[PDB]
Amino acid sequence: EDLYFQSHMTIAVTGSIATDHLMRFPGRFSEQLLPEHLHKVSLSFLVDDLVMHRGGVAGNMAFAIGVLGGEVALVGAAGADFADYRDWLKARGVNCDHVLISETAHTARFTCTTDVDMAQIASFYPGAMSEARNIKLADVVSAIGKPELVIIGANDPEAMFLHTEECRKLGLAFAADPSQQLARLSGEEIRRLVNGAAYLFTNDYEWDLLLSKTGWSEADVMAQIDLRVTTLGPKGVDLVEPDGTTIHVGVVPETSQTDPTGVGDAFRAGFLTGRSAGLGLERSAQLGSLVAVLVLESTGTQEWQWDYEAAASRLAGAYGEHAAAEIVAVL
Amino acid sequence: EDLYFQSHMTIAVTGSIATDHLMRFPGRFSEQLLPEHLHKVSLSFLVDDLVMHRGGVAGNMAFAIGVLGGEVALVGAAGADFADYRDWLKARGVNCDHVLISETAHTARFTCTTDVDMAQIASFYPGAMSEARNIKLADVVSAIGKPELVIIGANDPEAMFLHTEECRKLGLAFAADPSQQLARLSGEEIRRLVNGAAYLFTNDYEWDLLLSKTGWSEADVMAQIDLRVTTLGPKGVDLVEPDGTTIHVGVVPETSQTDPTGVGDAFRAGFLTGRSAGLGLERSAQLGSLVAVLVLESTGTQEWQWDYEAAASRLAGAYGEHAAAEIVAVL
Ligand SMILES: Nc1nc(F)nc2c1ncn2[C@@H]1O[C@H](CO)[C@@H](O)[C@H]1O
Numbered sequence: 001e002d003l004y005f006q007s008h009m010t011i012a013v014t015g016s017i018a019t020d021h022l023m024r025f026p027g028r029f030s031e032q033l034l035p036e037h038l039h040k041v042s043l044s045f046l047v048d049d050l051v052m053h054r055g056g057v058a059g060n061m062a063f064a065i066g067v068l069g070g071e072v073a074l075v076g077a078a079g080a081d082f083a084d085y086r087d088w089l090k091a092r093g094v095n096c097d098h099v100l101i102s103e104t105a106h107t108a109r110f111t112c113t114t115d116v117d118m119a120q121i122a123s124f125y126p127g128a129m130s131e132a133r134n135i136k137l138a139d140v141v142s143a144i145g146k147p148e149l150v151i152i153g154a155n156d157p158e159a160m161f162l163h164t165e166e167c168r169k170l171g172l173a174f175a176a177d178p179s180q181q182l183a184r185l186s187g188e189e190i191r192r193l194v195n196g197a198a199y200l201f202t203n204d205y206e207w208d209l210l211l212s213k214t215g216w217s218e219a220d221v222m223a224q225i226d227l228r229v230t231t232l233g234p235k236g237v238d239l240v241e242p243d244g245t246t247i248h249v250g251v252v253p254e255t256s257q258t259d260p261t262g263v264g265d266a267f268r269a270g271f272l273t274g275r276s277a278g279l280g281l282e283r284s285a286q287l288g289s290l291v292a293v294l295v296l297e298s299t300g301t302q303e304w305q306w307d308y309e310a311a312a313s314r315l316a317g318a319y320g321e322h323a324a325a326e327i328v329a330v331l
Numbered sequence: 332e333d334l335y336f337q338s339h340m341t342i343a344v345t346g347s348i349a350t351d352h353l354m355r356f357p358g359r360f361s362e363q364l365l366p367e368h369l370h371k372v373s374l375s376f377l378v379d380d381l382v383m384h385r386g387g388v389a390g391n392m393a394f395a396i397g398v399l400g401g402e403v404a405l406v407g408a409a410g411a412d413f414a415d416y417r418d419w420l421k422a423r424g425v426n427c428d429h430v431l432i433s434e435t436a437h438t439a440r441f442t443c444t445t446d447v448d449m450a451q452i453a454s455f456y457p458g459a460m461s462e463a464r465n466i467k468l469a470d471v472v473s474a475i476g477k478p479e480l481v482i483i484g485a486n487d488p489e490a491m492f493l494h495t496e497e498c499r500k501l502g503l504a505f506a507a508d509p510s511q512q513l514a515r516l517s518g519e520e521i522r523r524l525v526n527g528a529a530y531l532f533t534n535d536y537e538w539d540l541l542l543s544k545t546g547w548s549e550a551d552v553m554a555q556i557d558l559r560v561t562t563l564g565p566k567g568v569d570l571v572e573p574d575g576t577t578i579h580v581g582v583v584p585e586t587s588q589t590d591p592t593g594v595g596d597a598f599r600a601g602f603l604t605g606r607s608a609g610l611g612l613e614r615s616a617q618l619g620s621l622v623a624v625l626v627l628e629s630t631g632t633q634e635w636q637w638d639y640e641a642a643a644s645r646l647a648g649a650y651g652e653h654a655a656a657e658i659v660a661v662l
């Protein structure tokens with residue numbers, strides 16, 4: 001029981017802050033993935049495009065929460081070059097006071113290749129991100145009060161656990177969002193991020209990867225968390241309670257599949273923004289699905305716009321008049 | 332029948348010229364590749380290392396032929412920054428007079444991630460490489476005479492076919508070495524690079540990929556080429572005649588598995604250098620296997636050294652006293 005004052009009602013977003021280099025491969029990754037050679041791949045894709053955008057899961061989620069009008073603090077480590085990115089985030093209402101700025105290291109670099117089917121293969125060079133393990137959430141809480149929720153996104157692997165442990169001892173609700181780091185984290189490292197999570201967010205691949213590396217069954221997981229949120233690509237999202245009562249919400253139909261980078265981050269930000277404003281699970285995932293498709297339809301993770309009227313109309317089209325009115329009212 | 336004078340006995344190396352960014356993932360790619368999710372991967376690897384080295388298959392092969400004392404011309408397209416790389420190559424005897432230097436575009440960039448098992452996943456941004464389709468081999472032959480062999484390595488996809496067609500009409504022997512570009516090339520594009528090749532070089536994965544995309548059987552291929560050379564990783568290399576009489580040569584045992592980038596290029600350069608000096612197929616693959624392991628044991632593709640005495644001793648250790656003496660004498 002933490003007796004310190006409530007930040008009311010700020011979301012703290014912890015996780016990576018990066019520059020993304022996004023490229024396109026005009027072919028199919030799967031077609032190149034021979035099942036008998038997956039033991040030791042040798043893959044090289046000639047790309048026809050390369051563009052740079054602001055990124056990092058925490059930058060992406062903070063940006064979207066800010067666009068949607070939420071109170072949000074970004075907590076992560078960046079290089080000295082961060083001043084410009086800070087102005088871009090501040091322009092959408094993001095509190096960047098608690099970003100650790102490295103004296104020596106460079107802002108992290110994401111290099112990603114997307115194929116015609118929206119599959120993606122990418123590397124992430126941490127640089128200054130590794131110093132996130134030096135950030136104390138206690139000092140953040142000291143300054144702005146207790147957040148209603150701390151998001152634990154992909155980050156310096158040690159930082160992900162330290163931040164989670166801090167949430168546990170400070171009694172802060174947290175969302176486990178290890179998605180992007182599941183490949184790097186050992187089963188032991190994944191297991192210690194999960195217990196007591198208000199939300200666990202992944203896509204279905206990541207859900208299978210998590211269970212595969214943790215050695216856990218779905219039951220083992222549901223006993224430790226308040227809610228599992230599993231995005232299903234073109235099949236929408238499952239929201240599962242520990243019982244588990246399952247709410248399913250289908251996608252907002254896309255007009256293009258441009259670039260899927262940051263789609264999960266956007267869903268999570270919209271959904272959590274919905275939850276913060278007292279919408280239920282179904283309505284929150286409907287709002288999330290909209291921000292998600294807006295990212296899918298643009299190149300880069302923070303290159304989407306928010307038109308209130310366009311939003312209501314689209315929400316109406318996919319979910320009906322009730323959903324659209326309840327959602328738009330909350331914002 | 333080309334009546335123009337013989338370059339005697341120059342190898343022309345066509346293919347990519349690049350800067351390589353090499354990174355390491357301290358985990359296993361396969362462990363992250365769920366067979367039921369290979370339909371649409373979502374992969375992101377946190378890397379712990381990033382280093383830059385001179386690269387491109389044609390730069391790599393030209394460098395090695397030059398180190399081994401061969402006469403070699405590098406033929407490809409690079410950016411204005413190429414002046415420095417040119418000095419590095421010229422220092423090892425490489426003729427760079429026929430490199431096309433782009434007035435506007437940047438030297439190509441390779442971004443590669445290697446796991447603990449030496450598996451690799453990479454992207455290649457062409458930049459100035461795309462202008463290789465503007466290079467005329469006829470003009471090269473005009474200047475230096477007919478090469479004894481033209482290597483057709485991974486390149487601008489259109490350039491790979493144009494260069495091959497030029498070899499066919501100029502009556503130049505050529506080696507089809509599409510390896511790195513097989514992922515990008517259509518089955519139609521692969522099929523038109525093969526007929527009449529003096530050598531076809533691939534590893535076994537690439538051999539399966541080639542057959543898979545061409546719709547060809549091994550028999551269909553062997554009827555069109557003079558020799559198939561298929562590297563087998565830790566199992567060495569198969570050299571197969573159209574019959575097919577098969578010569579197999581095992582690896583030179585490694586003291587480390589440092590970085591496998593450029594290992595194939597090195598094998599090909601050593602092997603072809605062997606063939607140029609009148610060694611037979613077995614002896615040429617033995618020399619090739621040595622340059623190959625030297626690359627495996629160093630980081631980068633052209634960061635290996637050539638000690639004549641160390642070479643003889645290692646060749647002796649893996650292949651016996653006869654092989655070592657016959658090989659070292661030729662150089
Ligand atoms: N392995 C990773 N680790 C961390 F901390 N962040 C990563 C990783 N892979 C992708 N990203 C970031 O994810 C964003 C899209 O969700 C992108 O903006 C990108 O910066």
Ligand SMILES: Nc1nc(F)nc2c1ncn2[C@@H]1O[C@H](CO)[C@@H](O)[C@H]1O
Pocket residue numbers: 044045046346347349350351385386387388391441453454455484485486487511512592593594595596632
């Ligand atoms: N898709 C590709 N296309 C081309 F033309 N070149 C590529 C490709 N992938 C890797 N490379 C180069 O291969 C070298 C190692 O064999 C490396 O030095 C690298 O530059």
